[PDB]
Design a protein around this nucleic acid. Structure first.
Lengths: 384, 54, 121, 238, 255, 28
RNA sequence: GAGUCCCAUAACCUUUGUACCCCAGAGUGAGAAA
RNA sequence: GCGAUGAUCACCCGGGUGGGUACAAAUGGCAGUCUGACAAGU
């Protein structure tokens, strides 16, 4: 007595019309069951009659929920209204019994079915999937299922980017990478310009300064009192390097390199300057995120140190998980926490573990507890 | 690869004759034949296991 | 809805606070959070008791994660002051663990509360 | 034993997607969907192959009941590369990630969990593994998450509930293809502690039979765990 | 003369090989970091520079639907990323996370911008310090040849036998001690002429090319008044091409 | 059979249908 | 005639310089002070 | 005016040796830069 079948897709809602009714008495016969597997037989039973794809990602989740709590969405109401005739009562087959009463309320003239016969067809519809859509645009169900999957899940758990801490792990890995590469290039700039003016590399040991100074002094021959004041403005004259570079540039040993060579020194020196500037920018980005992600842990030990501990555990969830002893050895390879000295390290390790659990497991952690815990550590520090 | 390295060949011998190396270690009776396909691995430890298993 | 969940009713705390005492006498009790953490890693706990008035409460909520991962029952008692007194230690205890031993003299009532706690969950 | 500096010989196991690392200790091993880290701190192996560095993960039989199951010598494992897998009771990525390794990129694992707190780890873990679909929902009501699930070659259940068999049935009736795989892990203590462990296993086999599930095989999980068994059965809709 | 110093050569190649590396390392960091917001990009677009340019053009996936990626990607690929955008799987990100990732993508494109600049400059140095070599073997091979020796003179002082097998000492000395066949291509395998050859002829042209590589090189190194024209290399190139043509003209298979 | 061309609800399902029909009763 | 395809653009060892460490490690689990 | 929100717990003569982890350099070691007159067509 079934005529219409309601099915739901991640892309949208699909309605089917039952052309032929399978034998109900012999439902459990192998021969009827084999037909459900067989596409050719199944197409004789039903035919796809409607499909209305969801407008976007947001609608699918809203309907995905509304199906979950056994509710009818506006989208579902529109489709059923257009397809189901008013009619004694048209019979609709549905997977969920809970959706039954909801459908009956909105449409008094429809009778829902969720018996094994309905389940048997619903299984066949889901078995063949897009093959029954007869070329209609239903995208790819497997990916759309993936599209809705965590989307449905994270919603119930109320997952948010705020709890996300991977940004910290990426930042630390990048920051150390930047520091190594800034150093490696800056040395090459020293070698490159060292040929043209070796003494200057000795004068300004600070590599970042040296790149800036080389950018101004591209040619050591160019020496003017005004230029001396300019390079004097760079850093300070307390070291006296401003006078030394003028005197050294006058009497220095470096063989003059080509204009193309000097072009690259400043260009390469420009590259080192940008990375250090970005590294400073990323360092600040790390600093604020800890105050947002782990206000307690950062406030106890520090933003950078706390980040390194989290990276060692692999996630803030991992760090909160480990026992106090494990946390102590977690940063025992770089002396993050560092006989009386060892006692404080063990003491601090517990309070670091004390805090990590607070931050991870609080949706919006505060720093009120982090402050007092450090004050507790400070009292211990004075006592020992 | 054909013409396998001597060191790989020696290692395979050790696993096959694994029973005899340690007096206090004993193993299930087994007939070990060199696989048609395999790889050699270096095993990397966790940081927390620095003292225990490194 | 609260992070403290489930919380045993006044009667149940009494039987839970009962079992812990004999476990303390029988050396079958581990007292304090970090010990309770360790037992879960070794998988040697029937169940673990926590105080709902822990200051702050977020500190002991990692213990729930372990158990449900390890399919261990857990429950919260209203007072850490009361829990520590039953534990036999002169200081408040926020978390405690009953160690696994099918050879305990107090096996029967442990499985008794272990049934009620499961029903509570 | 399996200490860092030592080397191992990695070889295929009888089951596809399962590998054995030989040496002074024989380790059951699989390749990493996500090289460079461990899901639960597990022991990892690195191989240089032409040179790209492929990575291998160890299964702990004690932690993963399936790994203990494979170890006892199950005749058949439906879990295989290029197969759709639905994992019930996915507490975390401790075992689901291991299953995710076997199916490979081509297949997927539909992980099902009820409690929210472990899910957060599962969601994080399912991100790094594109082939893992976590569905945080009660398995008792598959209708709630029929939306997200297609055909499944094999259904695995480690749900430690008295009511598992009905849960398996509703999922298997709804998601498992005919002649599909069923792999159930049973805890006697959870089901009925009053009676011996043995009787429970016989009872549960019966509940599978009336649900049109044909039991193929039985394994008990000692020495790794007590009062545990894995049932392997085939879903005969006919 | 400042335009005829080989120490500039050995540094630039070392820098070039370096620059390839980190730009790769940053590329994975961008792919993983931005992969959180939109994991499906990496499978679609593999090029790091094209990958990075996308994040510059589109900051968020909502912006992806309407943004035009024609200049970066072809028509087929650009719609794939658009379709992936709405069925994307990554989470939304804050503007703060957006800003630095964009700045990171700015570094990626800039490094490619400089990397080609160094490549052009290195080629300029190749054609000025050892021109005759370049016409014969090339710029990119020619830079590494001198770098392996450490100086133009040192490589020039070497015989042709070493030049062909300068880059396979490991296989060489191992083969010599183990009574096994020796390498026949070494570093010179990547020259264009060797690529043109096939089969056993690759070994032939390697020997012939190396002999002329010495001829072109040792003119460049020891010339008092070399014209920066590369003529000797050009005639040397023609000889090898003629050698290749007749060598390839052979048919081992009987007619 | 259900047809889009003739309204099958017998009451105005969409709030638009509420607003328009109000004017039609108002108009004439 | 002749291994690019096991990074001689490299691995490992020695020496040297810089910064940390010598407490146990799945660390232990109820004493301490008087 | 305490504590389970955690008490307690390698060598030689204050010094020198010894060892471990991470980074950088060595024109320090392994480590020694293949052969040499035929080849090809009718």
């Amino acid at each position: 007595p079934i005529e219409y079948l309601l099915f739901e897709e991640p892309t949208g809602y699909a309605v089917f019309k039952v052309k032929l009714q399978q034998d109900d008495i012999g439902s459990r016969l192998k021969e009827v069951q084999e037909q459900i597997n067989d596409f050719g037989a199944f197409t004789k039973l039903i035919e796809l009659v409607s499909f209305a794809p969801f407008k976007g990602a947001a609608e699918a989740l809203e309907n995905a929920n509304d199906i979950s709590e056994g509710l009818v969405s506006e989208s579902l109401k529109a489709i059923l209204d257009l397809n189901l005739p008013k009619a004694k009562n048209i019979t609709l087959a549905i997977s969920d019994k809970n959706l039954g009463p909801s459908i009956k309320e909105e449409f008094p003239y429809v009778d829902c079915i969720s018996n094994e016969l309905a389940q048997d067809l619903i299984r066949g519809v889901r078995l063949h999937g897009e093959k029954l859509f007869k070329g209609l645009q239903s995208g790819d169900l497997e990916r759309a299922q993936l599209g809705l999957g965590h989307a449905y899940s994270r919603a119930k758990v109320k997952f948010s980017v705020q709890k996300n801490d991977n940004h910290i792990i990426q930042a630390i890995a990048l920051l150390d990478q930047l520091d190594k590469d800034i150093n490696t290039f800056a040395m090459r700039v020293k070698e490159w310009y060292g040929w043209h003016f070796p003494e200057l590399a000795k004068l300004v040991p600070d590599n970042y300064t040296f790149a800036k100074l080389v950018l101004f002094i591209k040619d050591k021959a160019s020496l003017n009192d005004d230029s001396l004041h300019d390079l004097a403005a760079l850093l300070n004259e307390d070291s006296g390097i401003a006078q030394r570079v003028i005197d050294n540039a006058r009497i220095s040993m470096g063989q003059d390199i080509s204009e193309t060579d000097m072009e690259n020194v400043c260009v390469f020196a420009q590259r080192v300057a940008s990375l250090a500037d970005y590294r400073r920018q990323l360092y600040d980005y790390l600093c604020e995120k800890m105050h947002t992600v782990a206000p307690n842990l950062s406030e106890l030990i520090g933003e950078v140190i706390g980040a390194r501990l989290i990276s060692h555990a692999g996630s803030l969830t991992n760090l909160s998980k480990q026992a106090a002893s494990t946390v102590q050895i977690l940063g025992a390879e770089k002396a993050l926490f560092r006989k009386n000295k060892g006692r404080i390290s063990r003491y601090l390790a517990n309070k670091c573990s004390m805090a990590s659990r607070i931050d991870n497991y609080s949706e919006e952690p505060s720093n009120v507890f982090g402050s007092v815990l450090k004050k507790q550590v400070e009292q211990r520090l004075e006592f020992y | 690869d054909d013409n396998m390295r001597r060191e790989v060949q020696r290692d395979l011998l050790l696993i096959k004759h694994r029973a005899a190396l340690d007096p206090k270690r004993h193993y299930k009776k087994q007939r070990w034949e060199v696989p048609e396909r395999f790889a050699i691995g270096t095993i990397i430890e966790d940081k927390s296991e620095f003292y225990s298993s490194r | 809805n609260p992070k403290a969940f489930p919380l045993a009713d006044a009667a149940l705390t009494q039987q839970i606070l009962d079992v812990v005492q004999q476990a303390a006498n029988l050396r079958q009790l581990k007292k304090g959070a970090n010990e309770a953490t360790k037992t879960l890693n070794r998988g040697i706990s029937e169940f673990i008791i926590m105080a709902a008035d822990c200051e702050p409460i977020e500190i002991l909520l990692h213990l729930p994660l372990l158990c449900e991962d390890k399919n261990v029952p857990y429950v919260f008692v209203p007072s850490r002051v009361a829990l520590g007194r039953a534990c036999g230690v002169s200081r408040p205890v926020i978390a405690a663990s009953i160690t696994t031993n099918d050879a305990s003299a107090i096996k029967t009532q442990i499985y008794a509360v272990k049934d009620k706690i499961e029903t509570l969950l | 034993g399996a200490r860092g500096g030592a080397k191992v010989v990695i070889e295929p196991h009888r089951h596809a997607g399962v590998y054995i690392a030989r040496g002074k200790e024989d380790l059951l091993v699989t390749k990493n969907m996500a090289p460079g880290e461990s899901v639960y701190g597990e022991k990892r192996i690195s191989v240089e192959e032409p040179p790209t560095k492929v990575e291998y993960r160890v299964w702990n039989p004690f932690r993963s009941k399936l790994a203990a199951g494979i170890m006892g010598g199950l005749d058949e494992l439906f879990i295989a590369p290029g197969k759709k897998v639905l994992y019930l009771g996915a507490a975390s990525g401790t075992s689901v990630s291991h299953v995710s390794d076997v199916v490979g990129p081509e297949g997927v694992v539909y992980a099902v969990e009820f409690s929210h707190r472990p899910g957060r780890e599962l969601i994080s873990m399912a991100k790094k593994r594109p082939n893992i679909i976590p569905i945080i929902e009660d398995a008792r009501h598959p209708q709630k998450y029929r939306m997200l699930i297609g055909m499944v070659d094999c259904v695995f259940a480690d749900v430690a509930q008295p009511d598992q068999a009905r849960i398996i049935a509703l999922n298997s009736h709804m998601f498992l293809k005919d002649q599909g795989g069923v792999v159930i892990s049973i805890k006697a203590n959870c089901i009925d502690s009053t009676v011996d462990a043995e009787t429970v296993f016989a009872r549960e086999v019966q509940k599978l039979r009336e649900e049109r599930i044909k039991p193929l095989e039985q394994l008990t999980l000692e020495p790794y765990e007590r009062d545990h068994c894995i049932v392997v059965g085939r879903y005969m809709r006919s | 003369s400042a335009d005829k110093v080989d120490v500039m050569i050995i540094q630039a190649i070392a820098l070039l090989d370096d620059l390839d590396k980190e730009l790769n390392t940053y590329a994975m960091r961008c792919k993983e970091w931005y992969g959180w917001h939109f994991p499906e990009l990496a499978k679609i677009v593999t090029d790091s520079v094209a990958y990075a340019r996308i994040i510059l053009t589109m900051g968020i996936r909502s912006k992806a639907s309407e943004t035009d990626l024609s200049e970066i990607l072809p028509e087929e690929i650009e719609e794939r990323v658009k379709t992936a955008a709405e069925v994307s799987m990554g989470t939304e990100i804050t503007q703060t996370d957006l800003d630095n990732i964009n700045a990171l993508a700015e570094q990626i494109v800039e490094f490619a911008a400089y990397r080609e600049q160094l490549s052009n400059y290195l080629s300029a140095r190749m054609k000025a310090i050892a021109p005759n070599l370049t016409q014969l073997v090339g710029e990119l091979v020619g830079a590494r040849l001198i770098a392996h020796s450490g100086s133009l003179i040192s490589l020039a002082k070497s015989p042709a036998s070493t030049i062909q097998i300068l880059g396979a000492e490991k296989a060489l000395f191992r083969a010599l001690k183990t009574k096994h066949d020796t390498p026949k291509y070494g570093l010179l395998y990547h020259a264009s002429l060797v690529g043109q050859a096939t089969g056993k002829n690759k070994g032939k042209i390697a020997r012939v090319l190396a002999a002329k590589a010495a001829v072109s090189l040792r003119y460049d190194a020891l010339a008092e008044d070399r014209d920066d024209s590369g003529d000797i290399g050009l005639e040397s190139r023609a000889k090898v091409e003629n050698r290749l043509s007749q060598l390839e003209g052979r048919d081992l298979r009987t007619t | 059979h259900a047809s889009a061309f003739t309204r099958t609800q017998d009451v105005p399902q969409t709030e638009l249908q509420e607003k328009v029909d109000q004017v039609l009763q108002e108009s004439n």
